[PDB]
Design a binder for this molecule. Structure first.
Ligand SMILES: [Cl-]
Lengths: 195, 240, 244, 231, 111, 243, 235, 250, 241
């Protein structure tokens, strides 16, 4: 785990997540996908404590998929984010809390608008034009404060994202082995293979 | 907690509560399942003593358990919701632990096990429901059709019907369904299903529901006009 | 032991019917009639109070029509006490959904859960079922205006127009006769009152023996308003249609 | 009649019919005999088969190195009660380093059976037991009835036609009680006792079951070719 | 604060031949710098030709041996007097020990 | 009707027929007695010798509670054992909390409340025994008799079983002829006589006599069984009186 | 009504006796034990020709060395098989060995009387449990809802049981080969079955020390059926 | 042991009646008459004190009970059932309202809580319904004065005026002739005494009649001074002497 | 007709099990009486010891619940002792929880509430007893409060219970019609006990020896029962007037 980023542009939400899985002095994997599709137009990326991350992500995935089958309907990104927040808000006062931070990128088909939510392990939710978890934010937020515009295209958003990864690859202490980038828009979720 | 043994043996070796639950199934609207060479079709009767219905919002007779499996039923409507909910939860639970969707046999075996449990548990009555469960296993193109009943027994069928006047439509299917050559196409399978319901139904208007399931999570429900075309075509060939 | 005194409330008859559910429906058939009519621009709820006394306080009274949330209401037919147990559960369920998803609960979801509770009392626990039938009137942004009914069995169905309680057979025939799909709210108001007036067991239909409510989009722009009618407002609407 | 629906109901003459019906299940069971001297205690049991293709239902169960019983009636109920005895014998060994007195074993069975005759929902045990053992006060023989009544005896028999063996042992009392330091003779007396309960059938090699415990003999069971000596 | 463990010293040794096996152990029992007993045996015949010793904290050692001896007794009761093979005994002892994984028997066991 | 089919149901008289039916089971049982004396109590019971095969002296029916109380009963023997097991638990918890051994009146109410509790619900059966019990405490000797209903009183002498009327008549003569009091050793002899006299109502099978006693002087306030020379002496006294 | 665990005046449990009547209505199952193996065979009995007969599962594996056949209310058997499989695997985990066939049977029979007012009623199914172990060799057990189990050299259960058992009494001897036992099950099943016996409405299986528990193919059974018809015509 | 009665004792009959509720209402019919009348500036509730023996002190038995400082209750039917309902009603006003909102519940909601308790005795395992009908009079800031009837089924209805019990049919007819929407509290007390005399047979005085009002705040009955917002209970039980004063100008 | 076996309503709105529990009250065939003085409350009850083998000192239907409260029971002794043990436990708990002695009327209400529960809950039968509680309350003064199987309770100027209760009741009524007051206008409890016995003799029409009666007396800060000789002393005083 470590680096997860999110950018909401005019017509889409773009999530970038690091590929490295490190334990001790060994990089065990360099192609790890730190994300789960909750519904056709909703994607969740995650970072935090080993084991907890995937266990939580898949538990949320199962619940949203269950809801979809029961009602024959897709929950809005706002509705999914609220469900996820409440689960984490419960978790923080449990015997052993989930130490997982998430970003939820979704396209609301009723509103025809992209939406990005940042939620930490305490259950702290905010809707944002761009988001980051962990030490990444200390570089990317100021960078995006300067270069981001609300009316950008998906291509402009990807170039803006390249600028973030380049900055992190220059100034971050750890080798995070690049990122997997995924786009959420009106047509659903797709992965950019060449980044 | 309420403990009473409601399902018990009688002197002749019958469990009357399980057998009376079968009578509730016999009262329910007719449901039929027919599987072709590359598909399964689920047909359902809807009684016409209810006009002024809103068909947009009224619970449909065929329910999706997962994207690749469907469940229809005959009997108590309220009872069926409990079985469907449990099945849908088990479907997601299976995907979570095995990392693969349920087989149709497995999903059937689970639903049947739930029904059996309600025949020797204290304080509960058996489900007044028999189900038809149809679909395709993951990465498989062989059609699957299973039946369950209140006792808990389940089995696979080339074609089967349940509900009121099901003995009449079973008679029809027994002489009209060839094991050596099942309905080769979607059209042939839907027609044989509609024909079988027309032996029992009344009018082919808003009384028949048809749902077609094809491999790789390809499930769609037919509209009134689409079904009405089968009804119109069958009647014209009949006058001969 | 106690086996001797157990009525066995959750068993089948030899014919495959649930005794207690059937007998609860028989109870409900003596309750005051309630009618729901769904129009294209709103829903009407109309209900007849059970034989009133002149010293009954009519304005501060609630017997038939209850509010579940801002978008959903119910008309009751059966034991009022039983209905209030279920109404409070339904009110809590709506708030649980809003708390979880930050969205108002879809009508069917609320109806299904309340109907599932009723179902449970017919399959396990050895308790008598709730002697209540509901007419649910509500709005959400998926299906718009919706009418549902549920009964002691826990079975529910959707309707364009429906009646529960007394004289449903006669009431349904009259609704089936004069209802059409392009109908407006003000027309539905008239149909509801006309139907009760003909099916009533009373001598004449008056304001003091009625409860009335509408669910319109007749607020200001793209939002829904619930109007539980006051006594004087029922008196006026009864004159406006020429029943009194 | 109207008072036999459950164990919690007394009849107008003060009888418990469910307990009496449980007692009836023992009478239908195959005969088993118990007898002792001052040095040894012996169980002899006639085993019963379903048909010529089936095995012969085992009647004797070991409870400890120094104790065991034979059964007549519902065999699963004997399994429950014998298991309880195994645990109680075992508790006495682990906690007190003490072999459970055969008398206490009887008291414990009595109290376990009793609780099932005073509460709603339960039923009486449907089996009778003959417990033999050798403890610090010598050889012992007990008779357990599912009413709760446990009785210490020199000799006895339970099951169908048990009255024949019970009469024989009542005549032979003075003889077999003084068969001290001689196992084979005490068994012979028990085999002759059970023979007084036979009708149309005789004792064969896969029909007879014998058990013995004593001063320098752990509780051991003999079946098959090991009982051919006594036919 | 109460310490539920102690060290009773001593040492044990097992060697296997072609058609035999030996299990040896000293008979001294100690706490700190004091001798509790010059002859306190800790190698036991458990039946079915199995000998066992659980050396370390004697209270846990005695408890384990006591539980295994009892396990042999019930194995006979439940499986028609069948002889408990040494490999089956070994697997059974693993479950006895691991059952207290979060409050362990403080012993090194040899059979 | 049907009022007698369920425990804890009042009949129109105000009676609990199930308890009265349990009394019939007590009347069917063997005879047992209790005699209060100068500084203690004496208990005796009839043991029917069903067969020669019964080991003499080895089917003991009198039971001790704590170290100072004796209990004997007639009727369903297992039911009596259940009551004594409870009595022992009650006495143990009393001594645990209060240190002193349980007083006899205190012990009597513990059994009484427990037996009475089995007349309150239809899910339990009443006790099929009448229990005679007592001992010595700080306030001297006490004798009690407890019935299936939960009813108990203090007694100068007590009797229950098939020969209760015969035994009661014989007990009343002792109370009249000895107003100052009966000694412990005398009461043992009288107990033997009364059991032998009460055996006339059960004379098909011959019987075995069993006696126990608590006395401040003779047994030091503890419950002991009468055995050997003192037992045979009491048997001989009884044999001489029937002839 | 009356208690579920009530005794009759003859000293039998009403519910256990009534469940035995349910088993008599069930389809026939036969088992024969030899020194070369144990054979298990059942009548499938499809209620309708449209029902796919190969989905009828009345012979079942418990472990590699233990198999099982059923008759009566077959839905009741599922939790019995689940328990048997868990008991077998659990014993292997605790003791690094195969569990004895008798011990398995005893474990299944412990569930039987765990009913009352535990489950609400006895099981309405009888089981034939066949297996092999090193101590007692090839074994066949009949497990009833009374909690009782008998070892058998041969046994039939179900509707045609009393007629089939009388036939097994005459035919069984201690030197039967496995092939002889296979044919004998087919022969006796064909006698008591309503519809004509073939590979689709009857199923064979066996357990041997070498190959373990095996359910036979419809092709393999069909040849044994043809071998049986030819031998009966040959004298 | 343990409560094995986990099943309903009240069930629907083929005709749709709930037998035990009907029979509970029959017990209420046998009960002594009680009534309630709502005025513009208050409410009056009244009943006869049926003495079981002249040696009994009827002052020690209170049929009219304070639930909150602004709410009172009276009944017809089985006294013991009423007594325990008053205990539960007083407690629920605290646990489910005052301990949450720091103020007493409005009349309608307390009535709603009592109704719930009575409904549960109609459906829960191993219990019979309560054999009483209640009349609850009260005041609260936002609803003003109100009067409710609660039946064994758990149903409740608001009334301008009503009567329950022995001679309720005649008493209701009497109240219909006399009640108007301009009645002052003293006029309502006068009508209450007139209505009750019809159903009472023996002695008719302040010792055989029990009567309480919900009216103006009573600062003298508060027990303390210093807090302006706290002004005292609106519930007041009329004394034996106060009743006799009004029986002279009757 | 299972509505007569458990505590559910009959068609006429009655509880037959409660009514039959009232009939169990008179099963002992004993009459009790309670009166109030200025400073005291006296309760008397008949004592019938038919069996010669009984220890007469252990035969009692009067109980000392607390230091201040006494209770006489009309009904079978098992149910009587059941009620007594509960009342003792309740009075002890009250003192521990609330820091002052449980009043007679409050204990009466509490025991009445428990009785009410048995009339509503099916698994519990009513106790076939009537409980008369007596004390000299520190607030209310001399007090008599009585409980029955219906769960009813009320205070009394005086009261009587048993088979011949009506005769005793009217006898007391006629005295209080004459005296024009709520109590026995007497200084000492000794003479209030004498009044109680005198008026029981007149109403029942029987004479009493020292062993035919049982007397309980409540004064400020203690309730106590009288010995046979205390009653004999009292019987002599009545005879010499
Ligand atoms: Cl209380």
């Amino acid at each position: 785990m470590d680096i997860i980023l999110g950018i909401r542009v005019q017509d889409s939400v773009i999530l970038a997540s690091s590929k490295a899985v490190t334990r001790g002095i060994s990089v065990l994997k360099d192609s790890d996908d730190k994300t789960r599709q909750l519904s056709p137009h909703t994607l969740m990326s995650f970072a935090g404590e080993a084991g907890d991350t995937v266990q939580f992500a898949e538990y949320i995935q199962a619940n949203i998929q269950l809801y979809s089958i029961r009602e024959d309907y897709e929950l809005s990104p706002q509705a999914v984010s609220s469900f996820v927040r409440q689960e984490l808000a419960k978790s923080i006062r449990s015997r052993r809390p989930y130490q997982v931070n998430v970003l939820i990128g979704g396209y609301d088909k009723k509103k025809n608008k992209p939406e990005l939510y940042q939620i930490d392990y305490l259950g702290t939710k905010v809707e944002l034009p761009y988001g980051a978890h962990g030490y990444s934010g200390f570089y990317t937020f100021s960078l995006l404060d300067h270069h981001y515009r609300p009316d950008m295209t998906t291509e402009e958003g990807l170039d803006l994202l390249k600028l973030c990864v380049q900055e992190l690859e220059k100034r971050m202490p750890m080798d995070f082995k690049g990122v997997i980038v995924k786009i959420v828009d009106k047509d659903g979720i797709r992965q950019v293979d060449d980044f | 907690g309420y403990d009473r043994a409601l399902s018990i043996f009688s002197p002749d070796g019958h469990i009357f509560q399980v057998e009376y639950a079968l009578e509730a199934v016999k009262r329910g609207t007719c449901a039929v399942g027919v599987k072709g060479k590359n598909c399964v079709v689920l047909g359902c009767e809807r009684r016409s003593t209810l006009k002024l219905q809103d068909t947009r919002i009224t619970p449909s007779k065929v329910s999706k358990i997962d994207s690749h499996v469907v469940l229809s039923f005959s009997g108590l409507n309220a009872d069926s919701r409990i079985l469907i909910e449990k099945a849908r939860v088990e479907a997601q639970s299976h995907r979570l632990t095995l990392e693969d969707p349920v087989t149709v046999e497995y999903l059937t075996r689970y639903v049947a096990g739930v029904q059996q449990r309600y025949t020797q548990s204290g304080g509960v009555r058996p489900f007044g429901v028999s189900t038809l469960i149809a679909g395709f296993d993951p990465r498989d193109d062989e059609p699957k059709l299973y039946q369950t009943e209140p006792s808990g027994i389940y089995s696979s069928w080339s074609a089967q019907t349940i509900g009121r006047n099901s003995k009449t439509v079973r008679e029809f299917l027994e002489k009209n369904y060839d094991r050596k050559e099942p309905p080769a196409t979607v059209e042939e399978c839907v027609k044989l299903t509609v024909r079988s319901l027309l032996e029992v139904v009344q009018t082919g208007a808003k009384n028949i529901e048809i749902t077609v399931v094809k491999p790789d999570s390809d499930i769609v429900a037919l509209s009134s006009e689409e079904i009405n075309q089968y009804v119109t075509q069958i009647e014209q060939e009949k006058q001969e | 032991g106690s086996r001797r005194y157990d009525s066995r409330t959750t068993i089948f008859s030899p014919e495959g019917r649930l005794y207690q559910v059937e007998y609860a429906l028989e109870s409900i058939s003596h309750a005051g009639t309630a009618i729901g009519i769904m129009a294209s621009d709103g829903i009407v709820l109309a209900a007849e109070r059970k034989v009133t006394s002149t010293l009954l306080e009519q304005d501060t009274s609630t017997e038939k029509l209850y509010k579940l949330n801002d978008k959903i209401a119910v008309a009751v037919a059966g034991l009022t006490a039983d209905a209030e147990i279920l109404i409070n559960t339904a009110r809590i369920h709506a708030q649980n959904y809003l708390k979880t998803y930050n969205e108002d609960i879809p009508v069917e979801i609320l109806v299904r859960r309340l109907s599932d509770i009723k179902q449970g009392y017919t399959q396990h626990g050895g308790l008598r079922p709730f002697g209540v039938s509901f007419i649910y009137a509500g709005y959400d942004d998926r299906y718009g205006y919706q009418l549902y009914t549920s009964n002691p069995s826990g079975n529910y169905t959707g309707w364009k127009a429906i009646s529960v309680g007394a004289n449903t057979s006669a009431a349904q025939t009259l609704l089936q006769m004069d209802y059409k799909d392009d109908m407006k709210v003000d027309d539905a108001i008239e149909l509801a009152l006309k139907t009760l007036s003909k099916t009533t067991d009373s001598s004449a239909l008056t304001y003091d023996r009625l409860e009335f409510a509408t669910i319109r989009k007749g607020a200001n722009d793209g939002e829904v308003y619930q109007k539980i009618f006051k006594p004087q407002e029922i008196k006026d609407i009864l004159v406006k249609t020429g029943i009194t | 009649n109207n008072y036999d629906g459950d164990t919690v109901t007394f009849s107008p003459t003060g009888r418990l019919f469910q307990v009496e019906y449980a007692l009836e299940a023992i009478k239908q069971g195959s005969v088993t005999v118990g007898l002792r001297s001052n040095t040894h205690a012996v169980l002899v049991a006639l085993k019963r088969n379903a048909d010529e293709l089936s095995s012969y239902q085992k009647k004797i169960i070991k409870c400890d190195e120094h104790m065991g019983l034979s059964l007549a009636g519902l065999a699963p109920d004997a399994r429950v009660l014998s298991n309880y005895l195994r645990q109680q014998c075992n508790y006495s060994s682990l906690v007190f380093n003490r072999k459970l007195a055969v008398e206490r074993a009887g008291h414990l069975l009595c109290d376990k059976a009793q609780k099932n005759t005073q509460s709603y929902g339960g039923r009486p045990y449907g089996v009778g037991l003959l417990i033999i053992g050798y403890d610090k006060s010598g050889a012992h023989l007990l008779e357990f009835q599912p009413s709760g009544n446990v009785t210490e005896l020199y000799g006895t028999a339970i099951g169908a036609r048990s009255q024949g063996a019970k009469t024989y042992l009542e005549r032979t009392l003075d003889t077999f009680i003084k068969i001290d330091g001689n196992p084979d003779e005490l068994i012979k007396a028990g085999v002759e006792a059970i023979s007084q309960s036979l009708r149309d059938e005789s004792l064969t090699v896969d029909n007879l079951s014998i058990a013995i415990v004593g001063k320098d003999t752990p509780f051991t069971i003999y079946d098959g070719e090991a009982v051919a000596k006594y036919i | 604060q109460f310490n539920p463990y102690g060290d009773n010293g001593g040492t044990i040794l097992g060697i296997a031949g072609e058609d035999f096996a030996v299990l040896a152990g000293d008979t001294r029992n100690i706490t700190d710098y004091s001798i509790n007993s010059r002859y306190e045996p800790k190698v036991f015949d458990c039946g079915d030709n199995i000998v066992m010793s659980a050396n370390g904290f004697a209270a846990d050692g005695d408890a384990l041996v006591k539980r295994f001896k009892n396990s042999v007794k019930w194995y006979h009761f439940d499986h028609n007097d069948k002889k408990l093979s040494i490999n089956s005994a070994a697997r059974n002892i693993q479950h006895l020990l691991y059952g207290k994984r979060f409050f362990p028997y403080y012993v090194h066991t040899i059979i | 009707t049907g009022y007698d089919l369920s425990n804890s149901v009042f009949s129109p008289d105000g009676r609990n027929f199930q308890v009265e039916y349990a009394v019939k089971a007590v009347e069917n049982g063997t005879t047992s007695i209790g005699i209060k004396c100068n500084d203690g109590v004496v208990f005796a019971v009839e043991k029917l010798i069903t067969s020669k095969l019964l080991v003499p002296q080895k089917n003991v029916k009198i039971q001790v509670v704590d170290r100072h109380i004796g209990c004997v009963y007639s009727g369903l023997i297992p039911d009596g054992r259940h009551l004594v097991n409870r009595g022992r638990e009650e006495a143990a918890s009393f001594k645990k909390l209060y240190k002193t051994p349980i007083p006899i009146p205190a012990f009597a109410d513990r059994l009484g409340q427990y037996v009475q509790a089995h007349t309150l619900y239809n899910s339990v059966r009443p006790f099929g025994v009448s229990t005679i019990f007592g001992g010595v405490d700080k306030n001297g000797a006490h004798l009690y008799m407890l019935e299936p209903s939960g009813s108990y009183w203090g007694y100068k002498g007590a009797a229950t079983g098939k020969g209760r009327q015969s035994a009661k008549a014989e007990l009343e003569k002792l109370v009249d002829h000895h107003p100052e009091g009966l000694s412990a050793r005398e009461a043992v002899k009288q107990a033997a006589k009364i059991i032998y006299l009460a055996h006339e109502d059960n004379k098909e099978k011959d019987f075995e006599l069993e006696i126990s006693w608590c006395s401040l002087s003779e047994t030091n306030g503890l419950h002991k069984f009468v055995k050997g020379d003192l037992l045979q002496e009491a048997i001989d006294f009884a044999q001489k009186e029937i002839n | 009504d009356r208690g579920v665990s009530t005794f009759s005046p003859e000293g039998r449990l009403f519910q256990v006796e009534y469940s035995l009547e349910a088993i008599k209505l069930g389809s026939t199952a036969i088992g024969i034990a030899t020194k070369e193996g144990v054979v298990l065979g059942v009548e499938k009995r499809a209620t309708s020709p449209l029902l796919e007969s190969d989905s009828i599962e009345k012979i079942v594996e418990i472990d590699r060395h233990i198999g099982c056949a059923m008759s009566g209310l077959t839905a009741d058997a599922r939790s019995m098989i689940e328990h048997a499989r868990t008991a077998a695997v659990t014993h292997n985990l605790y003791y690094d060995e195969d569990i004895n066939v008798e011990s398995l049977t005893q474990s299944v029979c412990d569930l039987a009387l765990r009913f009352g007012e535990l489950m609400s009623r006895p099981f309405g199914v009888a089981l034939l449990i066949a297996g092999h172990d090193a101590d007692d060799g090839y074994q066949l057990f009949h497990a009833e809802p009374s909690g009782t189990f008998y070892r058998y050299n041969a046994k039939a259960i179900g509707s045609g049981s009393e007629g089939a058992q009388a036939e097994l009494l005459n035919e069984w001897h201690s030197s039967l080969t496995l092939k002889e036992a296979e044919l004998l099950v087919l022969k006796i099943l064909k006698q008591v079955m309503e519809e004509k016996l073939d590979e689709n409405n009857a199923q064979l299986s066996c357990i041997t020390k070498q190959d373990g528990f095996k359910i036979y193919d419809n092709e393999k059974t069909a040849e044994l059926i043809k071998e049986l018809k030819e031998k009966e015509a040959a004298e | 042991m343990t409560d094995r009665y986990s099943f309903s004792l009240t069930t629907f009959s083929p005709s749709g009646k709930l037998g035990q509720i009907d029979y509970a209402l029959t017990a209420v019919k046998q009960g002594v008459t009680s009534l309630g009348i709502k005025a513009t500036n208050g409410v009056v509730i009244a009943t006869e004190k049926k003495s079981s023996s002249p040696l009994a002190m009827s002052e020690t038995l209170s049929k009219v009970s304070l639930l909150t400082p602004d709410i009172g209750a009276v009944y017809s039917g089985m006294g013991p059932d009423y007594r325990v309902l008053v205990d539960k009603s007083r407690k629920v006003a605290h646990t489910s309202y005052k301990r949450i909102y720091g103020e007493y519940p409005p009349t309608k909601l307390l009535v709603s809580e009592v109704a719930k308790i009575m409904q549960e005795a109609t459906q829960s395992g191993g219990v019979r319904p309560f054999g009483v009908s209640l009349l609850i009079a009260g005041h609260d800031e936002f609803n003003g004065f109100s009067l409710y009837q609660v039946d064994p089924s758990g149903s409740y209805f608001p009334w301008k005026a009503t009567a329950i019990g022995k001679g309720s049919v005649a008493a209701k007819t009497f109240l219909e002739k006399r009640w108007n929407d301009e009645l002052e509290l003293e006029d309502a007390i006068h009508i209450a005494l007139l209505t009750l005399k019809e159903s009472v047979e023996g002695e008719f005085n302040g010792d055989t009649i029990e009567l309480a009002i919900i009216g103006d705040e009573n600062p003298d009955l508060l027990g303390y001074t210093g807090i302006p917002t706290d002004k005292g209970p609106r519930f007041r039980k009329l004394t034996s002497q106060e009743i006799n004063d009004r029986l002279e100008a009757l | 007709g299972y509505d007569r076996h458990i505590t559910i309503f009959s068609p006429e709105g009655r509880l037959y099990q409660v009514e039959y529990a009232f009939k169990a009250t008179n099963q002992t065939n004993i009459n009790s009486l309670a009166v109030r003085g200025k400073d005291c409350t006296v309760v008397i009850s008949q004592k019938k010891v038919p069996d010669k083998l009984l220890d007469p000192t252990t035969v009692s239907y009067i109980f000392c619940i607390s230091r201040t409260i006494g209770m006489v029971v009309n009904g079978p002794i098992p149910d009587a002792r059941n009620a007594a043990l509960r009342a003792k436990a309740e009075a002890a708990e009250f003192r521990y929880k609330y820091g002052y002695d449980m009043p007679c009327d409050v204990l009466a209400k509490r025991m009445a509430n428990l009785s009410q529960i048995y009339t509503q809950r099916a698994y519990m039968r009513p106790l076939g007893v009537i409980l008369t509680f007596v004390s000299v309350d520190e607030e209310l003064g001399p007090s008599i409060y009585k409980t029955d199987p219906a769960g009813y309770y009320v205070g009394y100027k005086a009261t009587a219970t048993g088979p011949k209760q009506q005769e005793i009741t009217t006898n007391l009524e006629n005295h209080f019609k004459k005296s024009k007051i709520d109590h026995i206008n007497e200084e000492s409890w000794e003479k209030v006990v004498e009044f109680a016995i005198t008026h029981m003799i007149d109403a029942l029409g029987t004479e009493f020896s020292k062993n035919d009666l049982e007397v309980g007396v409540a004064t400020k800060d203690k309730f106590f029962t009288l010995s046979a000789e205390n009653i004999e002393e009292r019987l002599v005083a009545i005879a010499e007037q």
